From a paper:
HPVs are nonenveloped, double-stranded DNA viruses that consist of multiple copies of the major (L1) and minor (L2) capsid proteins. Each of the 72 pentamers is composed of five copies of the L1 protein, which can self-assemble into an empty T = 7 icosahedral shell called a virus-like particle (VLP). HPV L1 VLPs are excellent immune antigens for prophylactic vaccines, as they authentically resemble the native virion in capsid structure and immunological function. Here, we describe two antibodies, A12A3 and 28F10, that specifically bind to and neutralize HPV58 and HPV59, respectively, through two distinct binding stoichiometries.
As such, there are slightly different elbow angles among the 10 Fabs in the asymmetric unit. Similarly, the heavy chain buried 82% of the total buried surface area in the HPV59p:28F10 complex (625 of 725 Å2). In the HPV59p:28F10 structure, all eight residues (M267, G268, Q270, E273, Y276, K278, D281, and R283) involved in binding to 28F10 are located on the FG loop of a single monomer and are involved in 15 hydrogen bonds. Among these contacts, both Q270 and R283 form four hydrogen bonds with the antibody, suggesting critical roles for these 2 amino acids (aa) in this interaction. For MAb 28F10, all seven alanine replacements in the HPV59 pentamers affected the binding, with E273A, Y276A, K278A, D281A, and R283A mutations completely abrogating the interaction. Except for the D281A virus, all of the mutant viruses of HPV59 showed significantly reduced infectivity in HaCaT cells, particularly the E273A, Y276A, and R283A viruses, which almost failed to infect the cells. Indeed, the 28F10 epitope overlaps with the binding sites of heparin oligosaccharides on HPV pentamers.
Author numbering:
A (entry chain K): 1 to 217
B (entry chain B): 109 to 404, 439 to 473
C (entry chain L): 2 to 223
D (entry chain A): 209 to 404
């Protein structure tokens, strides 16, 4: 029913700065009753969500003074005075004024750091996998910043999208760098039908695509 | 009876009160929404006392079994059946709304206060216990009840019985829905005074109402008693903060309602002989075989009573007790 | 205060499953409880809520016929009876506490449980195939060398992510598994000094309890 | 004990909101062995519920959901269900009056038949049939300007109690035998101690 829109979904900030997350609803959110029932939750990495603010502007027990909720009607905001280390996580914005209780969609409070070029490594299919009839080539793009990055597999030659499986990690607890893995799985026959395999990484860091490639030896 | 005389309220936050039907010039309520008000009431005043050797018999109305092997529509009025049951400790008395099974005959859960809305109100069947053959159920009975109608009300909900069109004229709007015509008054027990008090007095049994003249077969005695003249309720409240900041807010106090009952039973018993002749004993056998059997298991433990063990409290020094002295004024 | 979810597993589609939640440290029978699930896409959704007494329950229309929330106040336990589940109901289910009886159901959940993940899919339990990832040739072979281990074709989650029996652990990136054709695929990379490997053995340990298998694979230069 | 059981300081009027209301334990005094506590007792009380009210504050006891149906708003807090009536003593009439009358004690309720041990006598009495309160007010100006404003008059409430106790006592002898006197000793050693 009611939809919750957070702005933005990813808010990179440095420690000591101010943070502001916006939340808008499609309906008035003011109950046929005294108060407005909008809440803010905080979820940290691999930890259940935890209540941060209830009823637009009431801090939960044990919530520091830095967090401050505000807003009314359909427009709400959350302000953090001084972003600290243990404030990094997904911030959810919930509404329970109207049934069903609805909340979305997650706001990642990430750390702001200096740019870093990715470290790319290719690995051909192992000897054990080639005995099973398949061939998987893996490309690791480790320790880069910012989060935005693009990968392109090319055989030989021509780009192939019909076999790529991608996975990303979140901000590492050490130095706040991102990483990515891309595994392209093809049949053994198609693997033996080509010689050169190239993994290409286009990243926001200077300059132009960073390339890694290999041949059959 | 111990506690002081007082009047206490029983209520319901969602009581089925539609319109004031007495002399209301305020307004009239719309039937659409939940037209249930928070209503309290002081019940009918009742004092009763029954002494026997068998638990007293009470009557109440229940949802009777289907008249025939007939499929009746859901929402129809069920048949009402009068039922006699032994009066156990904790049963509810008639409070001014009648003696019936409110749990079975009122799916509303909103016609009577919380005291009885899911309970059974029983009234002693004086007619049946007095017509008993042996008179074991009741050989001493004192009743004293009073009630009046305090406020007149209307009940919301669709009328199951169609108002016959012979009894009214609809007016110009020949579409007029007839208003609710199920009227239920709020009972009230009026003034409680110690002049009308029925306990804290000695009562001497000489002639019983039945043939059993106060003989406690199987060495037991059942005493049923109702006293609503001490219905005052203690209101205890405790702060939610460890110590109260000298500022009052309703959220910083938890409210509890507690009630108290205090009794002190006193009895004067007389030892008797029974010469076990023939004709006798055979008469006792036809009366209760278990009387001779216990001389030379129990069916009443299925019921809930307040146990009072006086095997260790019998004394022949009557002048050592108040009731004993009052009985010494009987020589 | 403790809210502990439990029960019961990862089960076939179109079948039933019962979820339990043990509460401690507060009057359980005094609060209204609720179930909140988190999708694999990491979005939180409201599943159910039951009154302080188990008489009043309410759900969203998306679960109206399948789920049934219940509670045992004598055992201080909360239950979610799911039946005829579809694959879209895959989630980490959380047991949450709302407002007490003396308040309007304000709908904020202050205390959350640890969570119990249930997934529903037609795929059956299959043991993973583990493959080592070593560099064939080497240009700028030094500073530093990065090995890898691949966990292909397992179901269901999870697996153990350890390198050298819990040793090392530095410079390790274990990537979240991605699913295709009802099967999981996971990858992990490790970075060590170039003159450290292959002088000393580096092996990835992968355990899959769902299939009751445990395999440790050593990476060989090949 | 309204002071100890009501931290609210707001459930009962100022008369008792920080005091203790005691009721005579007739059951205990009548079951007394010697009967010294009470050998003459007259009670006469009356009360009815005049107005019905509700108490604000969170209900400490959860209303069982078996006893009501919540209605369409299935998340609705049930209203306050702690009901307290306003008491009232109804009519005060001289027909129901209990004092200004002679009372002759012949037979006591206990074994002590009106004997004033230690030459003392305790008289407990409650009479609420003369509860009228005088309202005395004095102008704040030395002489009142002939215009009324509540700020120019101080209001005071004073109450008055008036008694006149009268007694008829009878002189008695106690032959200090054995069996006796030892019985008196077991009753109260201080009785013999105050004599000889």
């Amino acid at each position: 029913d009611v939809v919750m829109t957070q702005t933005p979904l990813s808010l990179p900030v440095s420690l000591g700065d101010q943070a502001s997350i916006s939340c808008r609803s499609s309906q008035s959110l003011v109950h046929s009753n005294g108060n407005t029932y909008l809440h803010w939750y905080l979820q940290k990495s691999g930890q259940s969500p935890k209540l941060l603010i209830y009823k637009v502007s009431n801090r939960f027990s044990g919530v520091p003074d830095r967090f401050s909720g505000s807003g009314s009607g359909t427009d709400f905001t959350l302000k953090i005075s001084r972003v600290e280390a243990e404030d990094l996580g997904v911030y959810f914005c919930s509404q329970s004024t109207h049934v069903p209780f609805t909340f979305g969609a997650g706001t990642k409070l990430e750390l702001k750091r200096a740019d870093a070029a990715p470290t790319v490594s290719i690995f051909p299919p192992s000897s054990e996998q080639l005995t099973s009839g398949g061939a998987s080539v893996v490309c690791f793009l480790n320790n880069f910043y910012p989060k935005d990055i693009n990968v392109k597999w090319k055989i030989d030659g021509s780009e192939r999208q019909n076999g790529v499986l991608n996975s990303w990690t979140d901000q590492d607890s050490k130095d706040s760098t991102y990483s990515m893995s891309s595994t392209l799985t093809l049949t053994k026959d198609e693997y033996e039908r080509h010689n050169s395999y190239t993994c290409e990484a286009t990243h926001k860091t200077s300059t132009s695509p960073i390339v890694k490639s290999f041949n059959r030896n | 009876r111990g506690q002081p005389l007082g009047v206490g309220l029983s209520g319901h936050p969602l009581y089925n009160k539609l319109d004031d039907t007495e002399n209301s010039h305020v307004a009239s309520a719309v039937d659409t929404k939940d037209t249930r008000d928070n209503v309290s009431v002081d019940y009918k005043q009742t004092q009763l006392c029954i002494i026997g050797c068998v638990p007293a018999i009470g009557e109440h109305w229940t949802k009777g079994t289907a008249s025939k092997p007939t499929t009746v529509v859901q929402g129809d009025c069920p048949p009402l059946e009068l039922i006699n049951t032994p009066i156990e400790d904790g049963d509810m008395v008639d409070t001014g709304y009648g003696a019936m099974d409110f749990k079975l005959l009122q799916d509303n859960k909103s016609e009577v206060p919380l005291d009885i809305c899911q309970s059974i109100c029983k009234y002693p069947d004086y007619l049946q216990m007095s017509a008993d053959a042996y008179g074991d159920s009741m050989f001493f009975c004192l009743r004293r009840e009073q009630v009046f109608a305090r406020h007149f009300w209307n009940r919301s909900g669709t009328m199951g019985d169609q108002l016959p069109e012979s009894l009214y004229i609809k007016g110009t709007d020949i579409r007029a829905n007839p208003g609710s015509y199920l009227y239920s008054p709020s009972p009230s027990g009026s003034v409680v005074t110690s002049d009308s008090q029925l306990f804290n007095k000695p009562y001497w049994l000489h002639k019983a109402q039945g043939l059993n003249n106060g003989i406690c077969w199987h060495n037991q005695l059942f005493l049923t008693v109702v006293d609503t003249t001490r219905s005052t309720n203690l209101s205890v409240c405790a702060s939610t903060t460890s110590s109260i900041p000298n500022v009052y807010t309703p959220t910083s106090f938890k409210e509890y309602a507690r009630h108290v009952e205090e009794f002190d039973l006193q009895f004067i018993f007389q030892l008797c002989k029974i010469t076990l002749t023939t004709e006798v004993m055979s008469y006792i056998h036809n009366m209760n075989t278990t009387i001779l059997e216990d001389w030379n298991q129990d069916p009443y433990d299925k019921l809930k009573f307040w146990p009072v063990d006086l095997k260790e409290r019998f004394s022949a020094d009557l002048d050592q007790f108040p009731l004993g002295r009052k009985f010494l004024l009987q020589l | 205060v403790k809210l502990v979810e439990s029960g019961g597993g990862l089960v076939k589609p179109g079948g039933s499953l019962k979820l339990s939640c043990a509460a401690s440290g507060f009057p359980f029978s005094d609060y209204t409880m609720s179930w909140i699930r988190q999708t694999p896409e990491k979005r939180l959704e409201w599943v159910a809520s039951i009154s302080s007494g188990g008489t009043y329950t309410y759900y969203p229309d998306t679960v109206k016929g399948r789920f049934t929330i219940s509670r045992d106040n004598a055992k201080n336990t909360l239950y979610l009876q799911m039946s005829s589940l579809k694959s879209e109901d895959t989630a980490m289910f959380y047991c949450t506490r709302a407002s007490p009886y003396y308040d309007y159901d304000e709908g904020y959940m202050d205390y959350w449980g640890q969570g119990t993940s249930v997934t529903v899919s037609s795929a059956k339990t299959t043991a993973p195939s583990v493959y080592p990832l070593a560099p064939v040739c080497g240009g700028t072979t030094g500073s530093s060398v990065t090995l890898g281990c691949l966990v292909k074709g397992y179901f269901p989650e999870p697996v153990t992510l350890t390198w050298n029996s819990g040793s090392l652990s530095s410079g390790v990136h274990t990537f979240p598994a991605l699913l295709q054709s009802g099967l999981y695929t996971l990858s992990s990379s490790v970075t060590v000094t170039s003159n450290t490997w292959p002088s000393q053995t580096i092996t990835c340990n992968v355990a899959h309890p769902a299939s009751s298998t445990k395999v440790d694979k050593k990476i060989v230069p090949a």
